[PDB]
């Protein structure tokens, strides 16, 4: 049994909580570098310009060790987003890849911010049934 | 074995020619509807508006039977291209998803034209070694 699929994650509940697991896809984890640990359904066209589309399954390596410039999955106060990282102190800036979208600015003092993992690829399949 | 990886196809040669296959990927074919028969490397940003970026692997179901509005892999006199199909009689239009590319218009009477398959999805891993 292979990569889990996570959809809408509950506010203040771990991402890979069974309740969020919408299935197990048989894809070689090691086809991604580093290893894909799970797949997250992408909501919205924030990242349309790098090729991450609504409904896409983002192949994510579970880690907190991410460097600036990378595309990461981040939780800002009970909301999970897929953006490009630009941290500079207690000012983290989650940048999009779509002109219609404007950077998110998180102030680590005021809000909760965690890094759920690193984007390592994309699977776009449909409903298959 | 797994899903074959078709790269750049030499003129005249069939897609799955043994010396076009640069690997086999262990992805569950039935994760795509209909089945993924092979993965073709996308070359160009001719399709980027729908998330088919350069270096992406396109999941293709080997058919000649495709309807209008679908993303197809086609051959126009040995030019393996990935476009959207709009056929009106003997006027086949291969439309791109990019405002910098102009449609390909094919007169079936004049040009040789083959539908190689149906786009059934996208796998975007990088180099994994």
């Amino acid at each position: 049994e292979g990569l889990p699929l996570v959809g809408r994650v509950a506010a203040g509940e771990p991402l890979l909580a069974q309740q969020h697991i919408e299935g197990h896809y048989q894809v070689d984890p090691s086809l991604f570098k580093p290893n894909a640990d799970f797949l997250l359904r992408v909501s919205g066209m924030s990242m349309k310009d790098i090729g991450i589309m609504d409904g896409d399954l983002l192949a994510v390596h579970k880690t907190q060790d991410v460097r600036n410039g990378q595309v990461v999955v981040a939780r800002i106060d009970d909301e999970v987003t897929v953006k490009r990282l630009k941290k500079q102190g207690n000012k983290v800036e989650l940048l999009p890849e779509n002109s219609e979208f404007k950077p998110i600015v998180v102030d680590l003092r005021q809000q909760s911010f965690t890094i759920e993992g690193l984007a390592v690829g994309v699977i776009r399949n449909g409903d298959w049934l | 074995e797994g899903l074959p990886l078709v790269g750049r196809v030499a003129a005249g040669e069939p897609l799955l020619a043994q010396q076009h296959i640069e690997g086999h990927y262990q992805v569950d074919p039935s994760l795509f509807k209909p089945n993924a028969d092979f993965l073709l490397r996308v070359s160009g940003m001719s399709m980027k508006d729908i998330g088919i970026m350069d270096g992406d692997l396109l999941a293709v179901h080997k058919t000649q039977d495709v309807r209008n509005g679908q993303v197809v892999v086609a051959r126009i006199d040995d030019e393996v291209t990935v476009k959207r199909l709009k056929k009106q009689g003997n006027k086949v239009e291969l439309l791109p998803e990019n405002s910098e590319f102009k449609p390909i218009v094919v007169d079936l009477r004049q040009q040789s034209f083959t539908i190689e398959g149906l786009a059934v999805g996208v796998i975007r891993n990088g180099d994994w070694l």
Partner: nanobody
Amino acid sequence: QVQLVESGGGSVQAGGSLRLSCAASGSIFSINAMGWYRQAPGKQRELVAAITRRGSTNYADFVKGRFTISRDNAKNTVYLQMNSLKPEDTAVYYCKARIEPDSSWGTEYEYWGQGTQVTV
């Protein structure tokens, strides 16, 4: 400590069939992908052939169905059968591997072999 042990390689003429192998040893939690790169004097390091634990494989644009990468999960080994060799294939073939070592589960590091001369 993780180590990569190479064997195979040597001299051959046009055509022929040389066989490489590389084997990981030490405190390994998982091997995610083993494979081979080649360095030809003066140009850059190029990937030759990769293979994952569950058997996915990938080949460079210059190997046109002449090389065949294999794995032996028990022997923690990887093999490269290369036939139909060419002058332009001459290079040093370095083994490469992605390993999660015992210490760091979930963190993965790239490990390299010492290199093998392959002359055509």
